[PDB]
Design an enzyme around this catalytic site. Structure first.
Site, PDB file in Angstrom:
ATOM      1  N   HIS A  27      38.639  46.367  45.660  1.00 34.13           N
ATOM      2  CA  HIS A  27      39.196  45.117  46.157  1.00 34.13           C
ATOM      3  C   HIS A  27      38.365  43.854  45.906  1.00 34.13           C
ATOM      4  O   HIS A  27      38.964  42.773  45.835  1.00 34.13           O
ATOM      5  CB  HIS A  27      39.549  45.217  47.633  1.00 34.13           C
TER       6      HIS A  27
ATOM      7  N   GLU B  84      36.956  43.552  43.054  1.00 35.16           N
ATOM      8  CA  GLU B  84      37.294  43.467  41.633  1.00 35.16           C
ATOM      9  C   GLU B  84      38.536  42.627  41.392  1.00 35.16           C
ATOM     10  O   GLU B  84      38.538  41.721  40.549  1.00 35.16           O
ATOM     11  CB  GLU B  84      37.500  44.877  41.085  1.00 35.16           C
TER      12      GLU B  84
ATOM     13  N   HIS C 280      43.281  49.783  52.827  1.00 33.03           N
ATOM     14  CA  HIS C 280      44.725  49.638  52.744  1.00 33.03           C
ATOM     15  C   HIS C 280      45.305  50.265  51.487  1.00 33.03           C
ATOM     16  O   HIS C 280      46.528  50.385  51.383  1.00 33.03           O
ATOM     17  CB  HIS C 280      45.116  48.164  52.841  1.00 33.03           C
ATOM     18  N   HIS C 281      44.462  50.667  50.534  1.00 31.79           N
ATOM     19  CA  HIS C 281      44.903  51.524  49.445  1.00 31.79           C
ATOM     20  C   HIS C 281      45.029  52.979  49.873  1.00 31.79           C
ATOM     21  O   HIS C 281      45.612  53.777  49.133  1.00 31.79           O
ATOM     22  CB  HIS C 281      43.943  51.412  48.261  1.00 31.79           C
TER      23      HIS C 281
ATOM     24  N   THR D 299      44.705  31.277  51.412  1.00 35.72           N
ATOM     25  CA  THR D 299      45.413  31.060  50.151  1.00 35.72           C
ATOM     26  C   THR D 299      46.507  30.003  50.302  1.00 35.72           C
ATOM     27  O   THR D 299      46.762  29.220  49.367  1.00 35.72           O
ATOM     28  CB  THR D 299      45.985  32.396  49.663  1.00 35.72           C
TER      29      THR D 299
ATOM     30  N   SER E  44      26.587  44.764  31.835  1.00 29.93           N
ATOM     31  CA  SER E  44      26.887  43.459  31.250  1.00 29.93           C
ATOM     32  C   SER E  44      27.328  42.449  32.306  1.00 29.93           C
ATOM     33  O   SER E  44      26.879  41.295  32.302  1.00 29.93           O
ATOM     34  CB  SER E  44      27.962  43.609  30.177  1.00 29.93           C
ATOM     35  N   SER E  45      28.183  42.878  33.240  1.00 28.52           N
ATOM     36  CA  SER E  45      28.674  41.972  34.276  1.00 28.52           C
ATOM     37  C   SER E  45      27.572  41.587  35.256  1.00 28.52           C
ATOM     38  O   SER E  45      27.500  40.428  35.685  1.00 28.52           O
ATOM     39  CB  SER E  45      29.848  42.606  35.015  1.00 28.52           C
TER      40      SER E  45
ATOM     41  N   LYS F 154      45.159  26.514  49.681  1.00 36.10           N
ATOM     42  CA  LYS F 154      45.066  26.174  48.262  1.00 36.10           C
ATOM     43  C   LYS F 154      46.429  25.835  47.668  1.00 36.10           C
ATOM     44  O   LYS F 154      46.552  24.862  46.908  1.00 36.10           O
ATOM     45  CB  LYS F 154      44.419  27.322  47.491  1.00 36.10           C
TER      46      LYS F 154
ATOM     47  N   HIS G  75      45.499  51.881  28.795  1.00 34.13           N
ATOM     48  CA  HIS G  75      46.082  50.558  28.931  1.00 34.13           C
ATOM     49  C   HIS G  75      45.574  49.848  30.175  1.00 34.13           C
ATOM     50  O   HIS G  75      45.436  48.619  30.162  1.00 34.13           O
ATOM     51  CB  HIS G  75      47.609  50.664  28.943  1.00 34.13           C
TER      52      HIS G  75
ATOM     53  N   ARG H 166      55.420  57.014  41.024  1.00 31.34           N
ATOM     54  CA  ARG H 166      54.575  56.506  39.953  1.00 31.34           C
ATOM     55  C   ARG H 166      54.095  57.634  39.050  1.00 31.34           C
ATOM     56  O   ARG H 166      54.082  58.805  39.437  1.00 31.34           O
ATOM     57  CB  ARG H 166      53.364  55.767  40.521  1.00 31.34           C
TER      58      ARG H 166
ATOM     59  N   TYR I 278      39.710  40.295  43.151  1.00 34.51           N
ATOM     60  CA  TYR I 278      39.540  38.860  43.333  1.00 34.51           C
ATOM     61  C   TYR I 278      38.675  38.253  42.246  1.00 34.51           C
ATOM     62  O   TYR I 278      38.839  37.068  41.925  1.00 34.51           O
ATOM     63  CB  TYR I 278      38.970  38.545  44.713  1.00 34.51           C
TER      64      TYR I 278
ATOM     65  N   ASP J 173      21.268  24.784  27.733  1.00 31.97           N
ATOM     66  CA  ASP J 173      21.689  26.172  27.591  1.00 31.97           C
ATOM     67  C   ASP J 173      21.499  26.919  28.912  1.00 31.97           C
ATOM     68  O   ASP J 173      21.131  26.337  29.933  1.00 31.97           O
ATOM     69  CB  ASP J 173      20.963  26.846  26.416  1.00 31.97           C
TER      70      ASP J 173
ATOM     71  N   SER K  81      43.381  23.867  39.046  1.00 25.70           N
ATOM     72  CA  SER K  81      43.025  22.641  39.749  1.00 25.70           C
ATOM     73  C   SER K  81      42.754  21.515  38.771  1.00 25.70           C
ATOM     74  O   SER K  81      43.318  20.420  38.921  1.00 25.70           O
ATOM     75  CB  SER K  81      41.810  22.877  40.642  1.00 25.70           C
TER      76      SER K  81
ATOM     77  N   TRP L 257      43.599  55.527  36.076  1.00 26.83           N
ATOM     78  CA  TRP L 257      42.522  54.545  36.133  1.00 26.83           C
ATOM     79  C   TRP L 257      41.542  54.878  37.251  1.00 26.83           C
ATOM     80  O   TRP L 257      40.324  54.805  37.056  1.00 26.83           O
ATOM     81  CB  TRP L 257      43.124  53.149  36.294  1.00 26.83           C
TER      82      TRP L 257
END
Ligand code: HEA
Ligand code: HEA
Ligand SMILES: CCCCCCCCCCCCCCCC(=O)OC[C@H](COP(=O)([O-])OCC[N+](C)(C)C)OC(=O)CCCCCCCCCCCCCCC
Ligand SMILES: CCCCCCCCCCCCCCCCCCCC(=O)O[C@H](COC(=O)CCCCCCCCCCCCCC)COP(=O)(O)OCCN
Ligand SMILES: CCCCCCCCCCCCCCCCCCCC(=O)O[C@H](COC(=O)CCCCCCCCCCCCCC)COP(=O)(O)OCCN
Ligand SMILES: CCCCCCCCCCCCCCCCCCCC(=O)O[C@H](COC(=O)CCCCCCCCCCCCCC)COP(=O)(O)OCCN
Ligand code: CUA
Ligand SMILES: [Cu+2]
Ligand SMILES: [Zn+2]
Lengths: 236, 535, 53, 58, 269, 48, 75, 117
Positions: free
Chosen positions: B243, B245, B292-293, B318, B159-160, B321, B64, B440, B247, B94, B258, B129
């Site tokens: 980290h 990832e 920090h993880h 942040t 791919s990315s 924004k 999941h 957890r 963002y 294109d 926006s 994960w």
């Protein structure tokens, strides 16, 4: 201590480190509540006043003073938060003379406790293994998935140093009330320190994932007086 | 043969976005049913649906996680909205490398097969994960499950990377005649700033995963402590990807909001240059913090103090924004259509889920919250209520333009309110369970944690009903959608002003700030023959 | 490296009790290799390398 | 004729009415083994991933 | 735009690719490679001739892409000044990504070299592992690489002065000056005392100098297709982008080898 | 042939089998696969 | 009256994995010379019996008795 | 495939842009080997003619309905972005002039007409 059924907040403390944690959290929540209330009031004003309005102020798009006020004001909050965080990080530890050492090795699905002092001349070190009591063999009144067969028994008002390691995979020693959460990785020793101010029972559970029997591995700490600890150590 | 050369052997960038959408819908359905399986087991104490198997609980949680970090949010936010809208906003025909777009699509269906086949040939892959080294070895997971699951994180990486290089190369030299790189819209800047992190983060993940594979099957001992290695190294080599990832999942959302705030409130965005500089600062300060993880692994006392300082700094860009969105919504006229409902429900819940991140940033306070459900409640308010809401708002904004068929307004509003109520019921008592001390990744828990687990199992059944209603909204859009434009005035892109008469408004209907909403609405296959002109 | 090509032709008829002693961490065989026998890597000459049981 | 067939094949790839990958009278030798062996390589990894879900080993 | 018969030609300088089947076939080859490598390593197949078909089909798929890249540039004639700039930016953003894989492997070296564990008695190259002397064959490879970096500059400066014999000879000498590197480094892997499984030291030394081996087979291929495409008159004196990408790829590998020789072969204590 | 039902990979109108069956079967498979996986791995491990 | 190891400021950090190894090596260095019954070499004995788990000491003793031990015990 | 051009006055398509051939033993020049839209740029830049324009919109004079700004296109529509008469006053507003209707820019007011070439 024990978890309560419909809990909202922390468990009760028996160590100065947990009281410092609680005080720092209650200091941060002040500023976070202030910021959330400010944002919610601005959205309430926007919904109540400027919904389906005839006049559009489509030329107020620059700002020069107001962009400094939302850049410097959060910084001051971060400095005020950062002062007691650094004081709590550095100050409350084992500065002077720990008085005992207990090695808590984590095996696959149980705990192994060695009291490394009290050594005879032949190596007669006191040692035990703590397992979980199954549901079928519980007696009347014991807590399910938290109650063990052998419990770590320590005195009160004594600095205790825990050295944690492991033999199979990565575990995590936890007693929530005492403020102890350190890993157990299989090739290095880690240390924590605890001082207990009142007698009672303190319960805990493992955290880092280890396999199928992750949910059955409790930790139980009793804090007896000194006379009872001496009488207990002459029996084991 | 014309079916094959146009929907299987393709070159057009807008025809791959629809395939990305169809793939993302399927891979977001599978994970949601897997989450319903988990939440129906964590309901009351005991062993309820899975009879005694604590495997096939960790497998479901792992699958999941993977199906919605890698197979739903990224294909929707990169394939459906990036491939389609960026050439039309910058004014190109294109993409620069069209065959690389086709391979970046077609690497994903072989990545779904290996992940679905990592849960049938064996016990499975219950490593979580984060595939940590000493559990995912050959002493706990000895079979072709972890190996076929870390081959599904290679194809997605390729791919990315191939998509990100295409996005960066296109926006540099394929603009129109009068656009410098300071008149670009904000969504193009969001795609650029996520495409730079996709370059700078994915080699470290590929190296760490490949070294884990070599440790498992070629007995190399990078991360085994009986030969001279440490598991903690892998944690470094994972979280340097981890980290950036998170963002990558959230920066393409921001720009979408926006546009909605610029549209249905008829005002331009307050301080656009400040917004692009804020996104640049957020993108840069997501690479200098990763540890920090890991505060409980046994670091130094002078290293925690650096990572508490470098983590709370990200609150400063942040806030610019958020307050600029408030300043944009302040003065103008607001009409509450179904994109602006999701826009209004994003500015409040991202703040609530993000203020919990300041509490977890301290190393002193992380001793009480690590591997606890407070973390889960923190990141579900931002992932499920920050990214999925932006995806739904983007769909309800851009789907009449792409498709040409409108939708019923009332059913969309019912779907939005059901999502709101059920998701706010589901993830809020996780904070209480975290503060009381529930760890957890546990199937069974002590009897004290029962009551809140009865309430968080009730909101999931509300959210699945909203997903089924969303399916019926899509069906009512496709059939009889030509006749769903006179029911409500939501179909109008912008409302008449105070002095603008109706007769004048029907002659001059569309007023915009981008090229998007002036096209014919099926967009043409070749949409620019002569170039566009900007002063 | 042709003067070193005659100090390696005699390190093949050495018995198993005259080879250099093996430490721990020295030959990790915890998963058998899938090509041929499980005690040999890709590049493996017996004249320089051996695995004593 | 000479090694400058460049001014001859540029009048062939333009005005061809076939796709580029199958325009020359040599692409048979490249395209027949490749598509022949690809349909065996794919059909062998869909037999060994379904035989293996049932527990059968070799 | 006010030239007379302007409607008959394309009005923007960008390349519209025709419909091609190769993205699907590359993915279908990588499906087979991933599943076969996941299965043969744990039983379930036995015969090792499906993996080799998978690798062969992948490499033929890239070769079949590069054919249609060549025909669209030397025969159809759709490569303007803008498309060449796009290709150069693209190749630079793959060279940058292939550098950052080596950064993680270098950081996996300094995390163990500085601070070794207790199981290894605290010492680099540990007790019982004799390292490779850096005054032997790892000097010959370095001087061959520095010579190959010098010979291709005589090949790029002979295609600009319109000398044909002087572009073919330099590329030939470079192609034989990379084959000798592979031949020397396969002889240094058969005369070694320590394997991939003999320590954390033998496991990181054959994983940073083994990726370089795969990266230098690619230069032998890319220089064969640059000699063969020059022999058949495809290169003009101002439009050659096959040479420019092979020159930028060789120099990055030389600089990377000069950091794989001071950190891996010389520095041990 | 450019129009409002031209950019979609599936045909919607003037079709023999009505569109409700291909629309429903897609979601049925999507919400039925991860129960089949749990059924297989439950039956392979003894429990019912 | 419950006395253990103090601070030892050369190892002030949270990882005590080097204190164990250094105490073990120092005890065997000072027992190779100066006899086996001597007074300051019981400070080291109480030092590594108070931090090291027992299985590590058993493995190190077997590795020493087989001749196979990575260390600097030879002065 | 047909007669080869010398200047861009004799280029009626892609059928006039093949060119002569190089000789055996010579590195060829771009005037001896180029076919498509590459040789068209080459024959433009050796005279002074820019085939692909990169000049932005007229930002000098406004637009009246009697005297409108003429935007040149080979289609019936062209997308025009207005941002002001002093060239950065008006924000970015996009417009589509057509051969049957003129755009008029709801904020500043310039009128655009389409010239079909
Ligand atoms: C979804 C993307 C996402 C986002 C946006 C964030 C946002 C942040 N995250 Fe991250 N984080 C994750 C992804 C994300 N995170 C994930 C997935 C986890 C779970 C880990 C897992 O198990 O793998 C995690 C967990 C996590 C932890 C806990 C790690 C652990 O379990 O111990 C921490 C703690 O440092 C952290 C840091 C932060 C911080 C400080 C922010 C901040 O950016 C939040 C910023 C928001 C604001 C601050 C609102 C701004 C409003 C203002 C008006 C400013 C006012 C100024 C002040 C507050 C001073 N995150
Ligand atoms: C990707 C972000 C994401 C999303 C969307 C969700 C969705 C949900 N998650 Fe969360 N969850 C995680 C992040 C996310 N989760 C992660 C990373 C983990 C793994 C943690 C671990 O492994 O340690 C996890 C695991 C996890 C667990 C298991 C915890 C564990 O085992 O320790 C639980 C259980 O309560 C839970 C709760 C839920 C619930 C009830 C939902 C429900 O919201 C599910 C219902 C889904 C919807 C409401 C949205 C449907 C989406 C679409 C159909 C829209 C398609 C979009 C377009 C049309 C454009 N999640
Ligand atoms: C035929 C099939 C070829 C398939 C190639 C790819 C997969 C290879 C996996 C490793 C297999 C292996 O065992 O490699 C061994 C070789 C040489 O190592 P050896 O054979 O043990 O050498 C000992 C020589 N003595 C001392 C006896 C003289 O070691 C090497 O040189 C291997 C180098 C592999 C480098 C991989 C790096 C991965 C990390 C980067 C991730 C990027 C993505
Ligand atoms: C933390 C703050 C968070 C704020 C959240 C957003 C609230 C809504 C803001 C709406 C935007 C307001 C705005 O842009 O207008 C400004 C008004 O200044 C102001 O209203 C602020 C002025 C600050 C005054 C400070 C005290 C000065 C008196 C000191 C006495 C000693 C300047 O309007 P403009 O000039 O940009 O209009 C330009 C002509 N088109
Ligand atoms: C390793 C994976 C990444 C390697 C890809 C590097 C590609 C660099 C060369 C490049 O960017 O050109 C594109 C692909 O060419 C190529 O070089 C094709 C390489 C395709 C490799 C696919 C990954 C297999 C593993 C052009 O592609 P285009 O056809 O769109 O150019 C259309 C106009 N002529
Ligand atoms: C997966 C392996 C990596 C895949 C990527 C391959 C390298 C990237 C290729 C970069 C090519 C860039 C490019 O478009 O250059 C064309 C030449 O193509 C070419 O012919 C370049 C040759 C590329 C061969 C790649 C061989 C690597 C495979 C080895 C795997 C082991 C231009 O053509 P042009 O304009 O210069 O022609 C002049 C007409 N007068
Ligand atoms: Cu044992 Cu966790
Ligand atoms: Cu984080
Ligand atoms: Zn204007």
């Amino acid at each position: 201590d024990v978890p309560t059924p419909w809990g909202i907040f922390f468990q009760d403390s028996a160590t100065p480190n947990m009281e410092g944690i609680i005080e720092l959290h209650n200091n941060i929540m002040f500023y976070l509540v202030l910021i959330l209330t400010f944002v919610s009031y601005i959205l309430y004003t926007i919904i109540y006043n400027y919904s389906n309005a005839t006049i559009v102020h489509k030329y107020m798009n620059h700002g020069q003073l107001i962009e400094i006020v939302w850049t410097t004001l959060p910084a001051v909050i971060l400095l005020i938060i950062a002062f007691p965080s650094f004081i709590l990080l550095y100050l409350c530890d084992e500065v002077i003379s720990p008085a005992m050492t207990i090695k808590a090795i984590g095996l696959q699905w149980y705990w192994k406790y060695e009291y490394s002092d009290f050594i005879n001349d032949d190596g007669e070190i006191v040692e035990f293994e703590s397992y979980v009591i199954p549901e079928e063999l519980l007696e009347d009144g014991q807590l399910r998935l938290l109650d063990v067969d052998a419990s770590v028994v320590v005195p009160v008002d004594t600095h205790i140093r825990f050295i944690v390691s492991s033999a199979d995979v990565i575990h995590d020693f936890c007693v929530p009330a005492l403020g102890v959460k350190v890993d157990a990785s299989p090739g290095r020793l880690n240390q924590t320190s605890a001082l207990i101010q009142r007698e009672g029972v303190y319960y805990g559970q493992c955290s880092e994932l280890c396999g199928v029997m992750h949910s059955a591995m409790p930790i139980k700490i009793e804090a007896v007086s000194l006379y009872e600890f001496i009488n207990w150590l002459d029996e084991q | 043969m014309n079916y094959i050369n146009r929907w299987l052997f393709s070159t057009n960038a807008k025809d791959i976005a629809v395939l990305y959408f169809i793939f993302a819908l399927f891979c977001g359905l599978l994970g949601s049913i897997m989450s319903l399986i988990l939440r129906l087991e964590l309901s009351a104490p005991g062993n309820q649906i899975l009879m005694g198997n604590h495997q096939l609980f960790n497998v479901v949680a792992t699958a999941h996680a993977v199906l919605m970090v890698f197979f739903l949010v990224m294909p929707a936010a990169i394939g459906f909205f990036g491939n389609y809208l960026l050439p039309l906003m910058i004014g190109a025909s294109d993409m620069s490398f069209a065959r690389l777009n086709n391979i970046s699509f077609w690497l994903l269906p072989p990545a779904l097969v290996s992940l679905l086949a990592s849960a049938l040939i064996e016990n499975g892959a219950g490593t979580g994960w984060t595939v940590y080294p000493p559990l995912a070895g050959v002493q706990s997971h000895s079979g072709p499950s972890v190996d076929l699951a870390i081959f599904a994180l290679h194809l997605t990486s390729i791919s990315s990377l191939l998509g990100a290089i295409n996005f960066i190369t296109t926006t540099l030299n394929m603009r129109t005649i009068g656009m410098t790189m300071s008149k670009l819209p904000l969504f193009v800047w969001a795609v650029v700033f996520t495409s730079i992190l996709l370059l700078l983060s994915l080699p470290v993940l590929s190296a760490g995963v490949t070294l884990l594979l070599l440790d498992r099957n070629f007995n190399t001992s990078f991360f085994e402590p009986a030969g001279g290695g440490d598991p903690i190294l892998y944690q470094h080599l994972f979280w340097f990807f981890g980290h950036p990832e998170v963002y990558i999942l959230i920066i393409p959302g921001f720009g979408i909001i926006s546009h909605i705030v610029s549209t249905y409130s008829k005002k331009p965005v307050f301080g656009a240059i400040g917004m692009v500089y804020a996104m640049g600062s957020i993108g840069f300060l997501g690479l200098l913090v990763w540890s920090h993880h890991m505060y409980t692994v046994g670091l130094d006392v002078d290293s925690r103090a650096y990572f508490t300082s470098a983590t709370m700094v990200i609150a400063v860009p942040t806030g610019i924004k958020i307050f600029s969105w408030l300043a944009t919504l302040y003065g103008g006229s607001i009409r509450y259509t179904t994109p602006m409902l999701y826009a209004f429900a994003f500015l409040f819940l991202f703040t609530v889920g993000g203020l919990s991140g300041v509490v977890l940033s301290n190393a002193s306070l992380d001793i009480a919250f690590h591997d606890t459900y407070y973390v889960i409640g923190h990141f579900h308010y931002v992932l499920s209520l920050g990214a999925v809401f932006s995806l739904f708002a983007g769909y309800y904004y851009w789907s009449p333009l792409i498709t040409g068929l409108y939708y019923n307004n009332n059913l969309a509003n019912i779907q939005f309110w059901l999502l709101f109520i059920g998701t706010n019921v589901t993830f809020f008592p996780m904070h209480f369970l975290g503060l009381n001390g529930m760890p957890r990744r546990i199937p069974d828990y002590p009897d004290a944690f029962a009551g809140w687990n009865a309430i968080s199992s009730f909101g999931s059944l509300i959210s699945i009903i909203s997903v089924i209603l969303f399916a019926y909204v899509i069906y009512d859009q496709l059939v009889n959608g030509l006749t769903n434009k006179q029911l409500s005035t939501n179909s109008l892109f912008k409302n008449p002003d105070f002095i603008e008469s109706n007769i004048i408004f029907n002659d001059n209907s569309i007023k915009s700030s981008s090229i998007d909403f002036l096209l014919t609405s099926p967009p043409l296959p070749h949409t620019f023959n002569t170039p566009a002109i900007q002063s | 490296e042709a003067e070193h090509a005659e100090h390696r032709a005699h390190n093949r008829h050495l018995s198993d009790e005259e080879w250099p002693k093996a430490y721990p961490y020295q030959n990790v065989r915890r998963v058998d290799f899938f090509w041929g026998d499980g005690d040999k890597t890709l590049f493996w000459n017996p004249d320089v390398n051996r695995h004593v049981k | 004729t000479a090694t400058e067939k460049i001014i001859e094949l540029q009048k062939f790839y333009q005005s061809t009415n076939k796709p580029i990958y199958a325009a020359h009278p040599r692409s048979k030798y490249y395209l027949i083994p490749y598509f022949g062996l690809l349909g065996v390589s794919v059909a062998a990894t869909l037999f060994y991933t379904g035989r293996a879900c049932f527990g059968i080993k070799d | 735009m006010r030239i007379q018969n302007r409607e008959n030609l394309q009005l923007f300088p960008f390349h519209l690719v025709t419909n091609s089947p190769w993205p699907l076939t590359t993915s279908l080859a990588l499906m087979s490679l991933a599943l076969t490598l996941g299965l043969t390593m744990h039983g379930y197949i036995g015969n090792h001739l499906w993996l080799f078909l998978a690798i062969s089909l992948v490499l033929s798929s890239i070769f079949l892409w590069v054919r249609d890249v060549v025909i669209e540039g030397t025969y159809l004639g759709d490569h303007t000044i803008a498309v060449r700039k796009g290709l150069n930016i693209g190749f630079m953003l793959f060279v940058l990504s292939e550098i950052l894989i080596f950064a993680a492997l270098f950081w996996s070296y300094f995390h163990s070299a500085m601070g070794p564990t207790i199981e290894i008695g605290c010492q680099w190259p540990p007790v019982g592992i004799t390292s490779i002397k850096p005054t032997e064959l790892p000097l010959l490879n370095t001087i061959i690489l520095l010579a190959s970096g010098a010979t291709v500059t005589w090949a790029h400066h002979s295609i600009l002065y319109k000398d044909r014999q002087g572009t073919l000879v330099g590329l030939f000498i470079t192609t034989l000056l990379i084959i000798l590197f592979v031949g020397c480094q396969v002889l240094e892997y058969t005369w070694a005392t320590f394997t991939i499984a003999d320590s954390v030291f033998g496991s990181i030394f054959y994983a940073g100098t083994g990726l370089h081996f795969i990266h230098m087979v690619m230069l032998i291929v890319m220089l064969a297709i640059c000699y063969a495409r020059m022999y058949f008159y495809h290169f003009t004196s101002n439009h050659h982008l096959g040479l420019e990408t092979t020159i930028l790829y060789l120099h990055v590998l030389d600089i990377i080898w000069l950091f794989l020789y001071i950190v891996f072969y010389w520095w041990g204590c | 042939d450019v129009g409002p039902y031209s950019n979609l990979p599936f045909k919607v109108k003037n079709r023999r089998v009505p569109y409700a069956v291909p629309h429903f079967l897609f979601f049925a498979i999507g919400m039925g696969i991860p129960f089949f996986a749990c059924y297989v791995q439950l039956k392979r491990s003894g429990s019912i | 009256e419950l006395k253990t190891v103090g601070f030892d400021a050369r190892f002030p950090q949270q990882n005590q994995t080097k204190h164990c190894y250094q105490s073990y090596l120092d005890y065997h260095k000072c027992i190779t010379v100066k006899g086996e019954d001597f007074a300051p070499c019981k400070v080291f004995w109480k030092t590594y019996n108070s931090l090291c788990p027992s299985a590590w000491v058993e493995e190190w003793d077997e590795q020493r008795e087989k001749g196979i031990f990575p260390g600097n015990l030879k002065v | 495939q047909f007669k080869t051009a010398t200047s861009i006055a004799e280029v009626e398509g892609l059928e006039n842009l093949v060119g002569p051939g190089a000789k055996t033993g010579t590195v060829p020049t771009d005037l001896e080997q180029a076919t498509g839209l590459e040789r068209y740029e080459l024959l433009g830049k050796l005279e002074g003619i820019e085939v692909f324009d990169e000049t932005p919109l007229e930002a000098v004079r406004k637009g009246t309905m009697k005297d409108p700004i003429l935007i040149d296109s080979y289609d019936d529509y062209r997308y025009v972005g207005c941002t002001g008469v002093p060239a950065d006053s008006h924000n970015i507003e996009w417009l589509k002039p057509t051969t049957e209707k003129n755009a008029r820019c709801w904020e500043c007011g310039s009128v655009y007409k389409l010239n079909f070439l």
